[model samples]
Target: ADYQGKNVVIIGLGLTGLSCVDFFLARGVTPRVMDTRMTPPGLDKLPEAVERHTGSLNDEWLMAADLIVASPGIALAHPSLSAAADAGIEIVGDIELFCREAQAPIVAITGSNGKSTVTTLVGEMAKAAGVNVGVGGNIGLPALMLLDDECELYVLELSSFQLETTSSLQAVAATILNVTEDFGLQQYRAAKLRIYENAKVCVVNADDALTMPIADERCVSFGVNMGDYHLNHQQGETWLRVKGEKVLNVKEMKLSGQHNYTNALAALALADAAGLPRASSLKALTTFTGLPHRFEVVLEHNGVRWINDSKATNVGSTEAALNGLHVDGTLHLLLGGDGKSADFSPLARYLNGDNVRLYCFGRDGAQLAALRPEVAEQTETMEQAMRLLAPRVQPGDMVLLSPACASLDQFKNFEQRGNEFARLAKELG
Candidate 1:
């Protein structure tokens, strides 16, 4: 792994790419960095020692580099990656590099949705059990940047893009929470299997048949219906019970939705595999405050609760958010953003009766409006939509800001959009 005096070229200047640059330089490797955004806002914040190559990647830079470490966002079809692959220069990502360098045993979590929730929950459970741990990867900080000389466990939240580039870095335990229908099932499935390929123990959702059949490692199955353990609705939270006895009353976990119950189960299973005591795991589950922008309760106006779930960029995630809330009265669902090619079949299932009202915005608003004319209302922006939806909402109604599409058309990313929704909700209140 020594790259002293070697020319390394890093692609994309996002958090992961910048992290890769810092990690390499700390070990005496000064790499050349490139980003597609000509005036990327984060570029000037990078280390001054590294050479910057702004705008589109050039052929000359690709030919000169001894190694190329690319960000997940950069596709394989990109000229730089295609050229590097053809030239026999080793190509990898920050996750792959981190896996190679990490000394600690890894506990990897991967799925279409609920990855962050599961990963964070597992880390918290480990901490509560009195074990030293480091959590990163697709959530929090980049895994490569967090690597140290002495670390006990690495809890990684991996995405399809990160897993695609990883190899040989097997985890002691892995969890595939639930993979819902997305644009390309075959492609995403292949990427997900890469993470579990070298895992000693794999945990999957029993309800998701696709994940259960495809997993190759020894697995633990969990679900609302059947599992070695289960979480059933009780009081305000879902209760974690085993053999009809409450081992841990996790109904107080800060994370919302029954999907988070699945997340908690995945973490508990992994912690048990790692030799964590049940009591400690229970303590961690109770103290966990949940991540921001994923079913986050921002503000309550009058009697209507406004939830910011801007992290739901796909149809499956949005459907899960809706399912978790179980909106009692008329549910005013804020829909549309930068739409993907995913089918809206899951969303269509919830559009029945007069219990739900849709407020569509952004680019795909028209398409969503057309799909459900009976209960859908169209608006141009978040402010306007909230204004229009406020009058229609009843006393017990819920105003949910769950855009099942990318936020590129309106905001920088999901976090920005979610924060903006929260800000607007507060202002209105």
Candidate 2:
């Protein structure tokens, strides 16, 4: 791409931006960095000699650059960026840069929910098959940083935001697991659809039309009862099968829940598309314990189960958790947070049932509580809500913190919120 000696400017001084700085520096090219925040998170790591601009986006500096490697957090719709585009100054993201340089075949996955699980599952499958794999993008380390001398495969969990400026990623296999509203429904779907721009094999969710690719000839699908990869019920057991050929029994899987079953199918399809052995991929699926803060059972006190699903930051995820819920007693469901201006009505059908108690808290707590105020209670924070439920929770009951909103309102992120939930529940018990 001939980036050396070019007038390169990096916008946003966070992880991705810092990675860009290092990326250019390692190549003997020093790229200037900028951020809208006076003190961006990774500012302390920037070298003093590197050019710096902060507090406000420099229009002149941006427009004068030969290329801009923008962070995912900074919207291209910003006036200065849009102006830069109008003037024909090239702009791309970290993923786009990585795509142009990565020599390994890539397997890309994206969705409103289960993308992380599916991405991780595929990486584990690759590792099980003895492939030198690199896993990152939206889940762990930045994509460009994953470049190595010996890596053979890349499994990236791409966010809609990351896909915005990425145009060169021609993955060996790609899938849009599912879609839900975020950054406005239309823009979100468009960004997600971008994953298939030049993908070799399109793995899709047959249950969701929103995840379907424009060209179906190269597509493979996964669903509960429909798709090339589907769940088959035989002799009272559900088996993950490909075209009616049995692969793995669902009951033997370490990860529970129906949503996880779908996730397993998606991962299997991706692994297959990448030409990995089914035996190795299935071995990984059976041992995968699942990620933290997403339906993780944090504690069990006197037979009462405390489930931390802090990662259920959106309605679709919370709905999936609730649909797959299996408990003998009443469920004390906690919901609230930033809400991201998402519609809470989709969760109504699940909350309307008996044996469920709703507790709302955070920025959009009231919006969630209004769904079923007759049985719902409101609190200012997660701690307060947990305190309120502590005494009422019985040995046979279960406490689930699947907030159908983001944690930014009262916590640094979902991990912190989930940690607090676990700490408070363990102490209270």
Candidate 3:
């Protein structure tokens, strides 16, 4: 961990790499930050005196580094990194480096889905309890920036990418919380295992076998199922309980969905494990309505409501959106995009239109529509899908843009995709 005159090359100069510059500079190490994008968004933030390599991954600086700090999204399988690995160049990530330095209690959340919501929820919970807490990692600020002697707690939303490089993170509670599919199981486990590595407690999702902590005795689980921590229904009220004791009624919550119930349950479990106040955590459940692009309500026309769940980048995300909106069905689901080669078969079970209509579009539209071809309709773009569905949108119908796929095939990103959908829907109205 000595940065004294170390040649540290930062791969993928995104926010994490920028944080690396801040981190190394604090200890007098000049970072050689690099990214494949010629002009990544934050490049201007860094001064020219900062060593930078952009446009391509191949660079002599990368080969010459005594140690390499990898940003979260970079693939280690890159030939450049692989060769560096074979040469015994130690590679690590920002979070791993933060773990070795931060002098505060940490609660880490990771999942294919719901991690952001849960991370924000725990931060809110801590703040409501009047604790000095910092929230970030994959959610907002990098972990290094959140470190302060004044900050009492840190809630981090980590991705599989971040966790892969992290070990020896002594979080009061750590979790790879939730997910939807079997894609990247091996990689997922390897990364998630870092969360539970010699940790005090692993916040578990009882419903997901993959979310099982490596150790049983040193863990707390959250689920809709009855267990150590669960979302319960008692006399038409949704309650979060721990150890068969009621914690909070979910009906007081602003967000509407079973998934939110479980998300709150997980948040509560994380807070409790971190020793945050109970009443304050419960207060956050009622006040925290929703996060943007995660089943976020864009608008309503007459009886029709437009839900923008553009955050659903996979089948599980799409699955959460549909179930959250159409408990009894009649949801007009807009599905498709670049599926990232995801096995959409798991989504087949939720395709039952006993009360829903399917609108498929983008590169993988036909593939997804094939699941319910008899009841599904195909369109090439989200605009066309919304355009065609506009006339048929009834007072009771829900039009949800839960793409269940990556948006790059059609738009720059999910935000652009959802924004375009919002624009076109407003035009329809």
Candidate 4:
């Protein structure tokens, strides 16, 4: 893994790319960095030790490099990577490099959704079980940033992009939460399978049809009767049971929803496979604070709760958000964003009930509005929608911001849009 004098080229200067630069430079590896962005902030603060090429990927930089470390966002078909491949130079992602140098046992989680929840939960479970762990990759922090020589375990949240770039870095325990039919179903499914390709223990959701078919192990399956492990909601609490016996009363778990319980089951199963005690894993599950923008309680107005679930950019995630709310009262669902050519049929099926009212916004607003013209209403922005819907919303009604599309059309990303939603909601209150 020594890159001391070798000309290493890093493509794309996102968070991962910056991390790679810091990592390589610290080890006295003076790698050449190239980014497509005309002016990335990361490039501005780079140390004098590393040579940087900004603007675009050039053949000169590609030819000079003996090895290339690619950023996840840059597709495999990128001209730079394709050229590097033709040149016979070894190209790898930061994940691959991190895996090659990692000393600790890995617990990897991947799927269309819930990967972040499972990864974070698994890390917390390990910590609760008295094992030192670091969690990162497509979640809290970059994987390379958390890589330390002394860590006992690394819980990684692998996205399709990250998995596509990894090799023999197998997880000691792994789980594919669920793969739903989204814009790129086939591509995502193939990518998720890569995470389990080298895993020792594979945990899958029994309820999710796609996962059940491919899951190799019979250890713990979430949903109705697939294995010894099961999770079900009862009396306002999610209960985790093994062979029909309650093991963990997860109602007090900081994360909301039965979906999170499924995430917990996936995490705990991995912990159990790793030989962790049940008491330790249970303790972790109860105290862990969930990730933000995934059913995050933004504000409560006159007994009406407003949630910012801007992270639900796909149909499965949006459905999970809606299901997790457990809203006995009327649910005012905010839908639409920069639609990623995904089918909204599942969402349409859930709108049959009178308990929910759909408000559509952003680029796909009209399209989603058309799906449920009788039930769904269209709006141009969050503020306008809030104004229109707020007057109609009564006490005990849950106003949820769970758009099943990307936020690129109106906001920088999901987090930005979610924060904006929170700010706007507070202003209305």
Q: Best candidate, TM-score-wise?
A: 2
Candidate 4 lDDT, 124-161, residue by residue in tens: 88888778788998887999999888888898888878
TM-score of each: 0.72, 0.78, 0.74, 0.73
The predicted structure with the larger TM-score, 2 or 4, is 2
Q: Model 2, poorest ten-residue lDDT window?
A: 249-258
167-190, model 2: which lDDT tens digit per residue? 999999999999965557788888
Whichever of 1 and 2 has more TM-score, that candidate is: 2
Pairs in steric clash, model 4 = none
* Backbone clash pairs in model 4 (N, Cα, C under 3 Å; residues 3+ apart or in different chains), count: 0
* lDDT top scorer: 2
lDDT of 3 by residue, 139-211 (tens): 7898888978899888888888788777768888888776556436777677776777766778888888788
lDDT for each candidate structure = 0.78, 0.87, 0.80, 0.78
Candidate 3: regions farther than 4 A off:
37-43, 55-60, 179-184, 297-429
Model 3: what TM-score?
0.74
Clashing residue pairs in candidate 2 (N, C-alpha, C atoms within 3 angstroms): none
lDDT of 1 by residue, 1-429 (tens): 677887789888888888988888788888888887898666977888778888888668888788888888635558768877898887888988898888988998888777877888888888886778899889899998779776788899888888877886678888767677863778888788777777877777878876663745557877775786687776765567664667765535545566777777778888876667888887887777567888777875577677888988888788777665555477788997878766776787777776878889888888877669778888777778988877676666777887888888778889998888888888664
